[PDB]
Design a binder for these strands. Structure first.
Length: 159
DNA sequence: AGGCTGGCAGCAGAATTTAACCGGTGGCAGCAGCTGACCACAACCGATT
């Protein structure tokens, strides 16, 4: 499926350019690896081509995905558990899934709650992580000028 | 049939992994609103030599 030069999305790290395809040997068989150059912390990720779907690597979403995530990002009736730990584990396991809709849900919930009160060290760190990978995936989805994409996200969040 | 005493050997002391809400209360700290006494410059007196 994957080709050299494709821009795929890794689950917990956001965008990833597939820059080469290695052919390393483990247990005497040439399981080909693909190397991904993510840029969040400048790490090179190597995965087999077989377990790409098992680890859940995923192509970027289309314009139906864009209107779907904007539709879910502008939606009310988002009642949350009042317990701080329950809420934290809930949106952490939403963030770790790798779905654009779930990441947009986490950034809209924490954005409205930060606009309300301003939460915490851990939740501001989580909102920064989630919003930066959502901005990176959006800029990958439309080739649309990083930090101007941030202004786009701020505008569609503030509405 | 057992037992309690002799060297005997070993040991101790002394010297030179992760965080966050929520309630509620006492202390702080600053500031008009009186002060209520303090301070003072100046002027006005009470006999008295």
């Amino acid at each position: 499926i994957f080709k050299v030069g494709d821009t795929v999305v890794y689950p917990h790290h956001g965008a990833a350019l597939v820059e080469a395809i290695e052919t390393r040997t483990i247990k005497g068989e040439q399981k080909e690896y693909l190397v991904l150059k993510v840029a969040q912390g400048d790490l090179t990720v190597r995965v087999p081509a077989e377990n790409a779907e098992y680890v859940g690597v995923r192509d970027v979403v289309g314009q139906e995905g864009l209107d779907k995530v904007f539709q879910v990002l502008r939606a009310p009736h988002t009642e949350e558990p009042t317990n701080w730990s329950r809420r934290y584990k809930a949106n952490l396991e939403k963030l770790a899934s790798g779905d654009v809709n779930k990441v947009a849900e986490v950034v809209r919930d924490l954005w409205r709650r930060d606009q309300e009160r301003g939460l915490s060290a851990g939740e501001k760190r989580m909102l920064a992580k989630a919003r930066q990978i959502l901005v990176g995936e959006l800029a990958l989805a439309e080739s649309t000028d990083d930090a101007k994409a941030e202004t786009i996200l701020d505008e569609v969040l503030a509405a």
